[PDB]
Design a protein around this motif. Structure first.
Motif, mmCIF file in Angstrom:
data_model
loop_
_atom_site.group_PDB
_atom_site.id
_atom_site.type_symbol
_atom_site.label_atom_id
_atom_site.label_comp_id
_atom_site.label_asym_id
_atom_site.label_seq_id
_atom_site.Cartn_x
_atom_site.Cartn_y
_atom_site.Cartn_z
ATOM 1 N N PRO A 154 8.575 -32.594 1.820
ATOM 2 C CA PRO A 154 8.828 -33.484 0.680
ATOM 3 C C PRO A 154 8.457 -32.825 -0.652
ATOM 4 O O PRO A 154 7.803 -31.787 -0.712
ATOM 5 N N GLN A 155 8.916 -33.539 -1.675
ATOM 6 C CA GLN A 155 8.499 -33.219 -3.041
ATOM 7 C C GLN A 155 7.789 -34.449 -3.535
ATOM 8 O O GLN A 155 8.341 -35.575 -3.513
ATOM 9 N N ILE A 156 6.573 -34.282 -3.948
ATOM 10 C CA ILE A 156 5.714 -35.380 -4.433
ATOM 11 C C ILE A 156 5.563 -35.252 -5.945
ATOM 12 O O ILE A 156 5.079 -34.230 -6.470
ATOM 13 N N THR A 157 6.025 -36.298 -6.657
ATOM 14 C CA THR A 157 5.829 -36.296 -8.117
ATOM 15 C C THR A 157 4.397 -36.769 -8.386
ATOM 16 O O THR A 157 3.658 -37.262 -7.513
ATOM 17 N N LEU A 158 4.005 -36.629 -9.634
ATOM 18 C CA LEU A 158 2.592 -36.803 -9.999
ATOM 19 C C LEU A 158 2.352 -37.960 -10.960
ATOM 20 O O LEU A 158 1.285 -38.035 -11.568
ATOM 21 N N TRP A 159 3.316 -38.861 -11.055
ATOM 22 C CA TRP A 159 3.146 -40.076 -11.805
ATOM 23 C C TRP A 159 2.003 -40.922 -11.287
ATOM 24 O O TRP A 159 1.342 -41.609 -12.075
ATOM 25 N N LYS A 160 1.776 -40.902 -9.987
ATOM 26 C CA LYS A 160 0.751 -41.636 -9.311
ATOM 27 C C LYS A 160 -0.116 -40.623 -8.553
ATOM 28 O O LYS A 160 0.273 -39.469 -8.373
ATOM 29 N N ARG A 161 -1.278 -41.030 -8.072
ATOM 30 C CA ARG A 161 -2.097 -40.176 -7.237
ATOM 31 C C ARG A 161 -1.350 -39.786 -5.970
ATOM 32 O O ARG A 161 -0.765 -40.653 -5.338
ATOM 33 N N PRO A 162 -1.379 -38.500 -5.609
ATOM 34 C CA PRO A 162 -0.657 -38.010 -4.403
ATOM 35 C C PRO A 162 -1.460 -38.286 -3.153
ATOM 36 O O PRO A 162 -2.114 -37.418 -2.569
ATOM 37 N N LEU B 201 -4.113 -35.390 -2.021
ATOM 38 C CA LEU B 201 -3.741 -33.968 -2.016
ATOM 39 C C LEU B 201 -4.274 -33.348 -3.300
ATOM 40 O O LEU B 201 -3.841 -33.714 -4.384
ATOM 41 N N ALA C 176 1.864 -26.176 1.254
ATOM 42 C CA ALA C 176 1.979 -26.871 -0.039
ATOM 43 C C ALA C 176 1.944 -25.929 -1.219
ATOM 44 O O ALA C 176 1.083 -25.062 -1.287
ATOM 45 N N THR C 177 2.838 -26.153 -2.175
ATOM 46 C CA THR C 177 2.901 -25.420 -3.414
ATOM 47 C C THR C 177 3.046 -26.373 -4.583
ATOM 48 O O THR C 177 3.531 -27.499 -4.439
ATOM 49 N N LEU C 178 2.609 -25.907 -5.742
ATOM 50 C CA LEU C 178 2.826 -26.516 -7.011
ATOM 51 C C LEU C 178 4.047 -25.899 -7.662
ATOM 52 O O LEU C 178 4.121 -24.677 -7.670
ATOM 53 N N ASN C 179 4.974 -26.699 -8.160
ATOM 54 C CA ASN C 179 6.213 -26.183 -8.705
ATOM 55 C C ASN C 179 6.498 -26.792 -10.055
ATOM 56 O O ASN C 179 6.378 -28.007 -10.185
ATOM 57 N N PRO D 86 7.511 -21.908 -12.095
ATOM 58 C CA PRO D 86 7.016 -21.063 -11.008
ATOM 59 C C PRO D 86 6.746 -21.931 -9.807
ATOM 60 O O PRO D 86 6.708 -23.152 -9.837
ATOM 61 N N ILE E 144 3.644 -22.037 -7.197
ATOM 62 C CA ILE E 144 2.255 -21.594 -7.083
ATOM 63 C C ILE E 144 1.715 -21.997 -5.692
ATOM 64 O O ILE E 144 1.632 -23.185 -5.359
ATOM 65 N N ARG F 194 -3.113 -35.030 -13.997
ATOM 66 C CA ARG F 194 -1.749 -35.500 -13.830
ATOM 67 C C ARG F 194 -1.125 -35.971 -15.136
ATOM 68 O O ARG F 194 0.101 -35.864 -15.291
ATOM 69 N N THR G 119 5.409 -30.752 -9.625
ATOM 70 C CA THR G 119 5.424 -31.462 -8.378
ATOM 71 C C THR G 119 4.701 -30.678 -7.284
ATOM 72 O O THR G 119 4.549 -29.464 -7.411
ATOM 73 N N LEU G 120 4.259 -31.411 -6.276
ATOM 74 C CA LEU G 120 3.772 -30.806 -5.043
ATOM 75 C C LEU G 120 4.865 -30.790 -3.999
ATOM 76 O O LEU G 120 5.594 -31.792 -3.895
ATOM 77 N N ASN G 121 4.981 -29.658 -3.293
ATOM 78 C CA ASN G 121 6.081 -29.516 -2.381
ATOM 79 C C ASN G 121 5.602 -28.940 -1.054
ATOM 80 O O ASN G 121 4.811 -28.020 -1.092
#
Ligand SMILES: COc1ccc(S(=O)(=O)N(CC(C)C)C[C@@H](O)[C@H](Cc2ccccc2)NC(=O)O[C@H]2CO[C@H]3O[C@@H]4OCC[C@@H]4[C@H]32)cc1
Ligand SMILES: [Cl-]
Ligand SMILES: [Cl-]
Ligand SMILES: [Cl-]
Ligand SMILES: [Cl-]
Ligand SMILES: [Cl-]
Ligand SMILES: [Cl-]
Ligand code: NA
Ligand code: NA
Lengths: 99, 99
Positions: free
Chosen positions: A1-9, A24, A95-98, B1, B3, B87, B96-98
């Motif tokens: 998945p891709q988790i946006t950061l509008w809310k706590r992940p 996360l 998991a990565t930050l993008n 990027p 990360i 955030r 985003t987290l992926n």
């Protein structure tokens, strides 16, 4: 998945046969869970964060399921205000930050 | 990027014409940086984490560049152990987290 950061992940984890909610947390080196029993050996540790340090029990080689993905690593158990999945286990689920 | 998380996700930020290092932190609701001078009025806030709470100074609508990406938003200033990009600004840079 891709988790946006509008809310706590927040995700569901399974650890020690229990389901928990956990954050996360890319700013956490370590995974820290609220008080619970885990099997095997442990040793004491202090971990820091914004407001000072807490004492935790360090359990190694613990299997956790994180949003469906299994990982093994060290879990710290103690009086954390939030269950936190840190980098030691985020790496294992890819998991990565993008941006 | 993209990360990965084998190392701390440290980036360069620029605030008040100054470069600083900060952690991209999905576990942080808000952005908190070590003592520095910022313009304008501030408001009180208490934030809390692993070893309790700290008092910080809340500055709104502060210009801040994060890893090359421009943001304008709230910056908390106080005795945090590390500079943290939370955030509120990660969303402004499209993160985003992926997995
Ligand atoms: C409302 O806005 C907020 C409120 C709280 C915070 S926070 O810094 O307290 N924190 C909240 C989280 C605990 C629910 C963000 C975390 O990402 C911090 C961010 C953080 C990093 C370092 C120091 C202080 C805080 N990490 C942290 O506590 O990590 C612990 C666990 O593993 C270790 O890695 C870190 O590096 C070694 C020490 C810490 C240990 C930030 C902005
Ligand atoms: Cl939330
Ligand atoms: Cl989940
Ligand atoms: Cl580990
Ligand atoms: Cl990888
Ligand atoms: Cl590192
Ligand atoms: Cl903001
Ligand atoms: Na063990
Ligand atoms: Na302001």
């Amino acid at each position: 998945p891709q988790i946006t950061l509008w809310k706590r992940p927040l995700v569901t984890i399974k650890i020690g046969g229990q389901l928990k909610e956990a954050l996360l947390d890319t700013g956490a080196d370590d995974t820290v869970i609220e008080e619970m029993s885990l099997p095997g050996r442990w040793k004491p540790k202090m971990i820091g964060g914004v407001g000072g340090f807490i004492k935790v029990r360090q359990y190694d080689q613990i299997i956790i399921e994180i949003a469906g993905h299994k990982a093994i690593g060290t879990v710290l158990v103690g009086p954390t205000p939030v269950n936190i999945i840190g980098r030691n286990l985020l790496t294992q689920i890819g998991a990565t930050l993008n941006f």
